[PDB]
Design a binder for this molecule. Structure first.
Ligand SMILES: CNS(=O)(=O)Nc1nccc(Cc2c(C)c3ccc(Oc4ncccc4F)cc3oc2=O)c1F
Ligand SMILES: Nc1ncnc2c1ncn2[C@@H]1O[C@H](COP(=O)(O)OP(=O)(O)NP(=O)(O)O)[C@@H](O)[C@H]1O
Ligand SMILES: Nc1ncnc2c1ncn2[C@@H]1O[C@H](COP(=O)(O)OP(=O)(O)NP(=O)(O)O)[C@@H](O)[C@H]1O
Ligand SMILES: [Mg+2]
Ligand SMILES: [Mg+2]
Lengths: 312, 275
């Protein structure tokens, strides 16, 4: 990997924390608080009494064959090998009382979905650091594990007071993906237009999903369909029509003048409807916006703590 | 009020689980009941009145293949009280437990489901959410359909005009239901399409679109007409007439699907000629 001294220190520390954690049991967890819920799971701040550690415990209730559940639990153990400063830490996964538990590092900042709601809009200079972290995490996944994230969106980008930005809820388990897809219905979608239509063009799909998110976080509103005229000056569509619009209408784009030109070009390169013309990780990592944002000195940690109301 | 249940008369018990439009608990109300805490806690006045009218229609329904609808409470929060059903749902049997039914029994399940749907349609009731999750095998013999109707609480309102939104699973939704483009998408024929998906479950042991692992892909392609259940997954012991009836109920175009008297007659007819 390519870590500076702080990142390498923090990951070594994480693994040594994981050492105190043995076989994970339902009885060894004390519930502290609720963190959030989504289409399939509910997440809790919990205390692992044996080690004293504090974790985020996702619970998924799937009505599925025991063999499928066991295969999911088996495939999920690969998350032990997925160590990066841009990937949420994994402590363990197990089954109990009809529900699958995924135990993760607690990120005190939450997801960028929550942070967006508390911020209204996220400034371009912050979204640059976010873009760097997301690109680098997707890259780690593809180059160390041949994994594409498969669900890039604000809800699955986590942040914390120590400044870190990490990816979460990515498709490490195919059986889990298949099980989730046979159930609940969303109200918006971050799926690429080629994925909605069939075969997915490697990580390019993820990249579109990132760009869309970057637009949502920049204007403070999910950008399908784009603001007609009146909504834009301030500075519900059914799911099928949203998918139809994503596939058949032009891609969303940032409003001009209010955002820098490099960032506009960045998100437009990320939102090309043809997946081959669409920019890949190689190309985005050296894009004008990314060189500039990599240079800029931004206190992401302080911005986040101010936005949520925390202290340092 | 009429068929209203007062505040503290129901023993609310163990949590069973959550679905498209509520959370089910086991309870007591002159016997065991299912108490569904609806996902519409605070309802608008017009909505609550339409809900009362719908409950009045549902309370009149009685059939051997229909779970009894018993009433509703309004406090501590809005709920539904229905017949509790020992034994697992058709989904649990086919897709979790993997119960090995013989074709005679599979056809009998289809026939009883069609009986219940025929009755519901004769009383002019659109089920809206037919699926194997809402089909129970009581004593393993009788088929019981639940969670029918209740349109006024499957969506949420802003005044007298009601919003309209997709809920739960997409596998049983007809293309016109997926799209929401047509003025009123829900019809007898949407229930017929859902019944065709149930027939697919019975005759393949599988949910449709088993190879596809993208939810939104299914929504888009099924709504556009690009994707239909792969009927070649149907087992060898499945009668040809049942396959053709399945394909008839699954037509992309709403008007082409048969109604449930004809479906029931076909199922009975073919139940005769059997090994
Ligand atoms: C609509 N179609 S889709 O293809 O977009 N859907 C899907 N997308 C993406 C993934 C999946 C499945 C999945 C899920 C849900 C999952 C959740 C949590 C998890 O824990 C950790 N996460 C990150 C770091 C450390 C962890 F401990 C691992 C997971 O691994 C998984 O495989 C999908 F179903
Ligand atoms: N490790 C974590 N630390 C802190 N908060 C978390 C963590 N994991 C998840 N959350 C929170 O839990 C909420 C719900 O989790 P989740 O089940 O992934 O739903 P979601 O990702 O937000 N949307 P969806 O993917 O459609 O279900 C998220 O919005 C996060 O704010
Ligand atoms: N009358 C009942 N008796 C016993 N269990 C029931 C009854 N109704 C529902 N359940 C169970 O309660 C749980 C949740 O049901 P429910 O909320 O209705 O979701 P669902 O049936 O899977 N889909 P939907 O009915 O469309 O919302 C499932 O395990 C059902 O099998
Ligand atoms: Mg998430
Ligand atoms: Mg039900």
């Amino acid at each position: 990997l390519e870590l500076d001294e702080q990142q390498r220190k923090r990951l070594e520390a994480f693994l040594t924390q994981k050492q105190k954690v043995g076989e994970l049991k339902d009885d060894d967890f004390e519930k502290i608080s609720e963190l959030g819920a989504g289409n399939g799971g509910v997440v809790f701040k919990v205390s692992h009494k044996p080690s004293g550690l504090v974790m985020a415990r996702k619970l998924i209730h799937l009505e599925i064959k025991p063999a499928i559940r066991n295969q999911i639990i088996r495939e999920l153990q690969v998350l032990h090998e997925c160590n990066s400063p841009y990937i949420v830490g994994f402590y363990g996964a197990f089954y109990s009382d009809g529900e699958i538990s995924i135990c993760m590092e607690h990120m005190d900042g939450g997801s960028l979905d929550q942070v967006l709601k508390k911020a209204g809009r996220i400034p371009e200079q912050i979204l640059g650091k976010v873009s760097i972290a997301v690109i680098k995490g997707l890259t780690y996944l593809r180059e160390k594990h041949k994994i594409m994230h498969r669900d890039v969106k604000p809800s699955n980008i986590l942040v914390n007071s120590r400044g870190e930005i990490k990816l979460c809820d990515f498709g490490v388990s195919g059986q889990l993906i298949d099980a989730m897809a046979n159930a609940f219905v969303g109200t918006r979608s971050y799926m690429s237009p080629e994925r909605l239509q069939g075969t997915h063009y490697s990580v390019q799909s993820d990249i579109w999903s990132m760009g869309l998110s970057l637009v949502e976080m920049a204007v403070g509103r999910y950008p399908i369909p784009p603001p007609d005229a009146k909504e834009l000056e301030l500075m519900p569509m059914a799911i099928f029509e949203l998918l139809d619009y994503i596939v058949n209408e032009p891609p969303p784009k940032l409003p001009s003048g209010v955002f820098s030109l490099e960032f506009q070009d960045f998100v437009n390169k990320c939102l090309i409807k043809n997946p081959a013309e669409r920019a890949d990780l190689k190309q985005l990592m050296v894009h004008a916006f990314i060189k500039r944002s990599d240079a800029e000195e931004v206190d992401f940690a302080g911005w986040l703590c101010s936005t949520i109301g925390l202290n340092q | 009020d009429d068929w209203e249940i007062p505040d503290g008369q129901i023993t609310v018990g163990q949590r069973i689980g959550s679905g498209s439009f509520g959370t089910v608990y086991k309870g007591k109300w002159h016997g065991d009941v299912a108490v569904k805490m609806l996902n519409v806690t605070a309802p608008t006045p017009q909505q609550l009145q339409a809900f009362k009218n719908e409950v009045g229609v549902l309370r009149k329904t009685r059939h051997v293949n229909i779970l009894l609808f018993m009433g509703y409470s309004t406090k501590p929060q809005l709920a539904i009280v229905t017949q509790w059903c020992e034994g697992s749902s058709l989904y649990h049997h086919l897709h979790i437990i993997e119960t090995k039914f013989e074709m005679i029994k599979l056809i009998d399940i289809a026939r009883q489901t069609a009986q219940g749907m025929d009755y519901l349609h004769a009383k002019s009731i659109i089920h809206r959410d037919l699926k194997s999750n809402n089909i129970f095998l009581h004593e393993d013999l009788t088929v019981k359909i639940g969670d029918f109707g209740l349109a006024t609480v499957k969506s949420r309102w802003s005044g007298s005009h009601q919003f309209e939104q997709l809920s739960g699973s997409i596998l049983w939704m007809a293309p016109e239901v997926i799209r929401m483009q047509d003025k009123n998408p829900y019809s007898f024929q949407s229930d017929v399409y859902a019944f065709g998906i149930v027939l697919y479950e019975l005759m393949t042991g599988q949910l449709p679109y088993s190879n596809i692992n993208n939810r939104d892909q299914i929504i888009f392609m099924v709504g556009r007409g690009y994707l239909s259940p792969d009927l070649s997954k149907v087992r060898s012991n499945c009668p040809k007439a049942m396959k053709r009836l399945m394909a008839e109920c699954l037509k992309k175009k709403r008007d082409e699907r048969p109604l449930f008297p004809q479906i029931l007659a076909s199922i009975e007819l073919l139940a005769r000629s059997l090994p």
